[PDB]
Design goal:
Two copies of one chain form a homodimer. The first copy, chain A, is an alpha+beta fold and 373 residues long. Chain A has two domains: 262 residues, Aminopeptidase (3-Layer(aba) Sandwich), CATH 3.40.630.10; 111 residues, Alpha-Beta Plaits, CATH 3.30.70. Helices cover 31% and strands 25% of the residues of chain A. Chain A contains nine helices and 17 strands. In chain A, strands 1, 2, 3, 6, 7, 8, 14, 15 and 16 form a nine-stranded mixed beta sheet that branches. The longest helix of chain A has 21 residues. The relative contact order of chain A is 0.19. Chains A and B meet through α5, β11 and β12 of A and α5, β11 and β12 of B. Bound molecules: calcium ion (5 copies) and zinc ion (2 copies). The site of one calcium ion has 5 residues of chain B, from loops. The PDB classes it as hydrolase. Keywords: jcsg, PSI-biology. The assembly is dimeric. Crystal structure of a tripeptidase (SAV1512) from staphylococcus aureus subsp. aureus mu50 at 2.10 A resolution. Chains A, B are tripeptidase.
Amino acid sequence: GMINEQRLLNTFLELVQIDSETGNESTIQPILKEKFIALGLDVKEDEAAKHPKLGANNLVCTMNSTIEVPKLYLTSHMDTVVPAINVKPIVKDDGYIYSDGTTILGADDKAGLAAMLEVLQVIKEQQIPHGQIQFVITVGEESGLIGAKELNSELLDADFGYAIDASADVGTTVVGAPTQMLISAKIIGKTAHASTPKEGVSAINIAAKAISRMKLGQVDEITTANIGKFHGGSATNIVADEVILEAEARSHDPERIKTQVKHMTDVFETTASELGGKAEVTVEQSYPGFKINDNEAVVKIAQESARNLGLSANTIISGGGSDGSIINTFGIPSVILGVGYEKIHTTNERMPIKSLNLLASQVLEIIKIVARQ
Amino acid sequence: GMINEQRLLNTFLELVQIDSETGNESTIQPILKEKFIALGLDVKEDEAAKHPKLGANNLVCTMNSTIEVPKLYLTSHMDTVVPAINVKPIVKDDGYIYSDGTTILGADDKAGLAAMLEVLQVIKEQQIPHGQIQFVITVGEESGLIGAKELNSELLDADFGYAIDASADVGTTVVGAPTQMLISAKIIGKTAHASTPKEGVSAINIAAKAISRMKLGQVDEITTANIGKFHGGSATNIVADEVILEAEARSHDPERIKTQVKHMTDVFETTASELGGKAEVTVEQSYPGFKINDNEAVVKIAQESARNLGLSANTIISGGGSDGSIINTFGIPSVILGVGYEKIHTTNERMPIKSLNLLASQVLEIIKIVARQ
Ligand SMILES: [Ca+2]
Ligand SMILES: [Ca+2]
Ligand SMILES: [Ca+2]
Ligand SMILES: [Ca+2]
Ligand SMILES: [Ca+2]
Ligand SMILES: [Zn+2]
Ligand SMILES: [Zn+2]
């Protein structure tokens, strides 16, 4: 075929053996920079390292057009979740790459990086004509898309592109994603001895009553909410005067997320006030939602590339975020390609070899389709 | 007049400055033993020190009759709550003894001990006739009446007596105290990503809903219940699969405490099961309740002693336990005398000097009244 399977596997295995836990990207980043320079790209850094939760700058690597056709970008993230120091990957007879059980594999997202490096090597050695391609390697994706948020957008020059970073089968494309917001609550009551409970106001009882009347779980077909953490109270014989709650909400409609966050806020505040306490609520947007139209070129090209390789060509809506959630806010239409990694963020993480081969073949195919528009 | 007020004050100050945080009674215990022996008492020790939460044995100190009249016992506890290392008491012009604000005072319960020692010294030096009196000095009262629970009851020989350890004005007598039970619940759900909440079952939602269904606070006129601790969940983006609740219940009716604890147990178990989780509920009796009939000799002698000293002579019901709650289970009618200590278990704890004088005078009067019967 086109891609070198043996080389792609070796690249992937090399990459997972470079320690890059999120916020500690300073080892992997110079190595990736030098690899993309070695492949003939002009590699530029932004100033993301200045952020105190990030260990190196983002990389924006540009390959000149050798044809005019559309300007493409591709993105993967160089960081992994914890624990991912000294990953010892094992290729098995079942056709899956595993960790040894002591770490994550870091297929999320070094499969995406291995796929990008293999494709450039294939393009070089076969002189495949192509348009302009940007390879955007981010830091801190696993700390809440922080590299993407600190990205110098003037370094980008693209009509559309692809985040190689969806939890879906290879050939499935994520065409929309939700807005996510964090909602935290501090519920204050009044301390008393537990024998004289009329002298106090229990923040545990207020928080429990609030939660019991709150729209939570699958709030509707396109909206979710979850209380992740509930902590409060020091002793059985004391009326609890403080509870801390940490929650989230997600929706694919911006008006529904607004209503849901206001709802949670108001339920906490008015339940606490009714029972003689008070609620301090604070909110933070993690990322904004998007939906790319089904007839946009970026979608149809993704689908054609899947069809050409005998894959589903399905388009789905994700339950969460990626760097494409942020890059979409720059006005560059972006969809998220299935990588086919499994059990990510756990020490059982694994990568099917056939999926790595197809992903690499798909990214090549996308570049060729864009090159013939 | 009869109690030596300065000597009483000096004895109190001496005792508070000997560290006896609960479980670390090993230093104060032999110091107290020598004081009781030097005042002419036969002192016996049990084997409470073998208990791994207790640092010394209880002391049972017996004073033979110099008359036949009823056999009395008096009890105080030698331990204090934390923080009570390096207590630096201050006697102020407003008529109160304070700490320096970095520790508790330990008026609870060294006011009781001081009162006892002074009364013994007045009896000795004035040759006041008396019946048999036992002075029962416990350890671990502040760890849940643990020394009283380890007490060798065959060392006791009394018709009735008094725990000098109530949060009430001097001349007020506690004639009843409730049953307290601890109830703890581990609520288990099922983990899932917060974007797909139907795949999981939130233990936070279950635990909150259970609490909203439950009778809590002032359950009725003589029954209380409190959720003191509520802890669960690790992250906003994960459906929480575990919550630990720690609760209590109290009642002056031993059947209503059982009904309440069954009610709480049943609501946890049925709510968990309904919503697809489970509830593990464990119960422990901290201490049993009692109520001494108001016409009993022990109550009438406490009230008479109070009236003789110009004090209210009220009888109340307490909100909590004491060593008297345990000693009553041995069949020795016991009521709890108001000590007049204030803001106990806090670094603002204080002792009115006038209350200390009246308490020592009251204990002396009770011994005299018993000696006439
Ligand atoms: Ca930094
Ligand atoms: Ca990830
Ligand atoms: Ca679709
Ligand atoms: Ca011991
Ligand atoms: Ca106490
Ligand atoms: Zn990823
Ligand atoms: Zn006490």
